[PDB]
Design a protein around this ligand. Structure first.
Ligand code: BEF
Ligand SMILES: [Cl-]
Ligand SMILES: [Mn+2]
Ligand SMILES: [Mn+2]
Length: 128
């Protein structure tokens, strides 16, 4: 995929954001911003330029399922790739996110290999 693709990495905790940012760097993606919750995310996203979202689930202000739903419901960004990255591992949570239009779903904790496989699975699916 184009190494200029702009990423938004959303999570209410630094540690996770820093892990993902660094991993993206390792893969050749340096165009990366962070947000701390769904509201913060939608703000940056509305400032334009984003090609990919990676999002936590449990966050104050707006959780990741609500964020995903909002993104899918906005006509300007309804096809933005959204990859969930969360501790929520119950099948009902996976179903709910999938049905809400998640592009992919990784369960924390994850390996570097897992994140790369899943990002690539999404690239291939969307012909990126
Ligand atoms: F807080 Be997340 F959903 F891991
Ligand atoms: Cl999968
Ligand atoms: Mn913190
Ligand atoms: Mn969280």
């Amino acid at each position: 995929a184009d190494k200029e693709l702009k990423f938004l990495v959303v999570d209410d905790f630094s540690t996770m954001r820093r892990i993902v940012r660094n991993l993206l760097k390792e893969l050749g993606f340096n165009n990366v911003e962070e947000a701390e919750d769904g509201v913060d995310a939608l703000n940056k996203l509305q400032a334009g330029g984003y090609g990919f979202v990676i999002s936590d689930w449990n966050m104050p202000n707006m959780d990741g399922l609500e964020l995903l739903k909002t993104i899918r419901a906005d006509g300007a960004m309804s096809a933005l790739p959204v990859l969930m990255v969360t501790t929520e591992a119950k099948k009902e949570n996976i179903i709910a996110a999938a049905q809400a239009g998640a592009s992919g779903y990784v369960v924390k904790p994850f390996t570097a290999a897992t994140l790369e496989e899943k990002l690539n699975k999404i690239f291939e699916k969307l012909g990126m």
